Enzyme design. Structure first.
Site, PDB file in Angstrom:
ATOM      1  N   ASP A 180       0.787  -1.321   0.051  1.00  0.00           N
ATOM      2  CA  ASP A 180       0.086  -0.042  -0.180  1.00  0.00           C
ATOM      3  C   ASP A 180       1.004   1.240  -0.168  1.00  0.00           C
ATOM      4  OD1 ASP A 180      -2.056  -1.604   0.156  1.00  0.00           O
ATOM      5  OD2 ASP A 180      -3.149  -0.585   1.855  1.00  0.00           O
ATOM      6  N   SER A 215      -3.974   1.438 -10.891  1.00  0.00           N
ATOM      7  CA  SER A 215      -5.187   2.276 -10.830  1.00  0.00           C
ATOM      8  C   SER A 215      -5.137   3.434 -11.782  1.00  0.00           C
ATOM      9  CB  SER A 215      -5.296   2.712  -9.288  1.00  0.00           C
ATOM     10  OG  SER A 215      -6.404   3.299  -9.205  1.00  0.00           O
ATOM     11  N   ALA A 216      -3.915   4.211 -11.486  1.00  0.00           N
ATOM     12  CA  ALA A 216      -3.804   5.325 -12.568  1.00  0.00           C
ATOM     13  C   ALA A 216      -3.004   4.932 -13.883  1.00  0.00           C
ATOM     14  CB  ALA A 216      -2.935   6.423 -11.818  1.00  0.00           C
ATOM     15  N   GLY A 217      -2.406   3.813 -13.821  1.00  0.00           N
ATOM     16  CA  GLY A 217      -1.609   3.366 -14.914  1.00  0.00           C
ATOM     17  C   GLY A 217      -0.379   4.085 -15.198  1.00  0.00           C
ATOM     18  N   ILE A 218       0.261   4.721 -14.020  1.00  0.00           N
ATOM     19  CA  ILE A 218       1.654   5.430 -14.391  1.00  0.00           C
ATOM     20  C   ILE A 218       2.842   4.964 -13.392  1.00  0.00           C
ATOM     21  CG2 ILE A 218       0.480   7.427 -15.476  1.00  0.00           C
ATOM     22  CD1 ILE A 218       0.419   8.957 -12.615  1.00  0.00           C
ATOM     23  N   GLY A 219       2.362   4.680 -12.112  1.00  0.00           N
ATOM     24  CA  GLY A 219       3.345   4.626 -11.105  1.00  0.00           C
ATOM     25  C   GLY A 219       4.133   3.072 -11.005  1.00  0.00           C
ATOM     26  N   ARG A 220       3.115   1.965 -10.833  1.00  0.00           N
ATOM     27  CA  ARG A 220       3.650   0.724 -10.880  1.00  0.00           C
ATOM     28  C   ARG A 220       3.988   0.222 -12.116  1.00  0.00           C
ATOM     29  NH1 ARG A 220      -0.578  -1.549  -6.544  1.00  0.00           N
ATOM     30  NH2 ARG A 220       0.074  -0.341  -4.625  1.00  0.00           N
ATOM     31  N   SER A 221       2.986   0.867 -13.188  1.00  0.00           N
ATOM     32  CA  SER A 221       2.825   0.493 -14.478  1.00  0.00           C
ATOM     33  C   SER A 221       4.386   1.053 -14.970  1.00  0.00           C
ATOM     34  CB  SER A 221       1.769   0.922 -15.154  1.00  0.00           C
ATOM     35  OG  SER A 221       0.668   0.526 -14.590  1.00  0.00           O
TER      36      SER A 221
HETATM   37  O1  VO4 Z   1      -2.263   3.212  -9.438  1.00  0.00           O
HETATM   38  V1  VO4 Z   1      -0.621   3.630 -10.097  1.00  0.00           V
HETATM   39  O2  VO4 Z   1      -0.495   5.133  -8.622  1.00  0.00           O
HETATM   40  O3  VO4 Z   1       0.913   2.561  -9.336  1.00  0.00           O
HETATM   41  O4  VO4 Z   1      -0.174   4.956 -11.413  1.00  0.00           O
END
Ligand code: VO4
Length: 296
Positions: A180, A215-221
């Site tokens: 998290d 969720s956003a498609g930027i961080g973990r992606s």
């Molecule tokens: O839902 V992600 O905050 O890892 O872009």
């Protein structure tokens, strides 16, 4: 060189600064279509949009918009579609894109619920006997089988174009244990997962681009794509050192904004690339070390 710079940044305690430099230098392009009022309910986040120039277009007649970007890595010769986690009204759009882009794999790097909130719609079937129909896009989706491991699950799905009765097998790679707060448990479990995706074939040039989201498609992606491309590059050159992680990242941010969301994610990316490089350079046994260290 990578490990050199890593320690030096660790020793100087300047990840926050390094990351913030990447933010300052990152490309800024228009997201006009994303911002049209008719598309307001197709976006999960106000602050996370696809650039117009690299956005994926639905072959819909109605409205061709989905919050998704084509990250096209020219030199690595790999492409990725990064997208947000589908919304209750865009699950249809999501599978339409999967279908029209000829994608073979979907990498999901989040859980449906995180930190007590709903990060993603339940966009795939959880039981074999309850298939899903997407009326708006005329697609049918069926759970064929699933292989549950300790910290990730691989599902085999069948995707049917109801319009033409043609069908495909999609692989769903679901990483369930990214924390998290903070970054995954170790490089090892993350690299073990990436390598499962690679072994599946889902990244082959013979298929459409793999679809990657959190969720956003930027961080973990971002972390997943950056690591894969960096390893791919040093594999192609067999020269770990010509690879500039920060430069690669900035190249990816030409295609989608905000890739990698925290300085810690950046540090983790280095970690994973540095560790994954061991395998790249002739040490086959390291991959078996990650499988055991991941505890799958
Ligand atoms: O839902 V992600 O905050 O890892 O872009």
């Amino acid at each position: 060189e990578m490990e050199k710079e890593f320690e030096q940044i660790d020793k100087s305690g300047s990840w926050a600064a390094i990351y913030q430099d990447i933010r300052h230098e990152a490309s800024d392009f228009p997201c006009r279509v994303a911002k049209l009022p008719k598309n307001k309910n197709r976006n999960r986040y106000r602050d996370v949009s696809p650039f117009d120039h690299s956005r994926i277009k639905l072959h819909q007649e109605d409205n061709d918009y989905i919050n998704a970007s084509l990250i096209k890595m020219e030199e690595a010769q790999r492409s990725y579609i990064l997208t947000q986690g589908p919304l209750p009204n865009t699950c249809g759009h999501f599978w339409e894109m999967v279908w029209e882009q000829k994608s073979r794999g979907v990498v999901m790097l989040n859980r449906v619920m995180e930190k007590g909130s709903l990060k993603c719609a339940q966009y795939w079937p959880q039981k074999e006997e309850k298939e899903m129909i997407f009326e708006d896009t005329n697609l049918k989706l069926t759970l064929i089988s699933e292989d549950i491991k300790s910290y990730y699950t691989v599902r085999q799905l069948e995707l049917e174009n109801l319009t033409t009765q043609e069908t495909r097998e999609i692989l769903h790679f679901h990483y369930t244990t990214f924390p998290d707060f903070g970054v995954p448990e170790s490089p090892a479990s993350f690299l073990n997962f990436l390598f499962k995706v690679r072994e599946s074939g889902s990244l082959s040039p013979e298929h459409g681009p793999v679809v990657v989201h959190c969720s956003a498609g930027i961080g973990r992606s971002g972390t997943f794509c950056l690591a894969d491309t960096c390893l791919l590059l040093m594999d192609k050159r067999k020269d770990p050192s010509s690879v500039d992680i920060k430069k690669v990242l900035l190249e990816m941010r030409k295609f989608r904004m905000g890739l990698i969301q925290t300085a810690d994610q950046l540090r983790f990316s280095y970690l994973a690339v540095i560790e994954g490089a061991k395998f790249i350079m002739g040490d086959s046994s390291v991959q078996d070390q990650w499988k055991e260290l991941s505890h799958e």
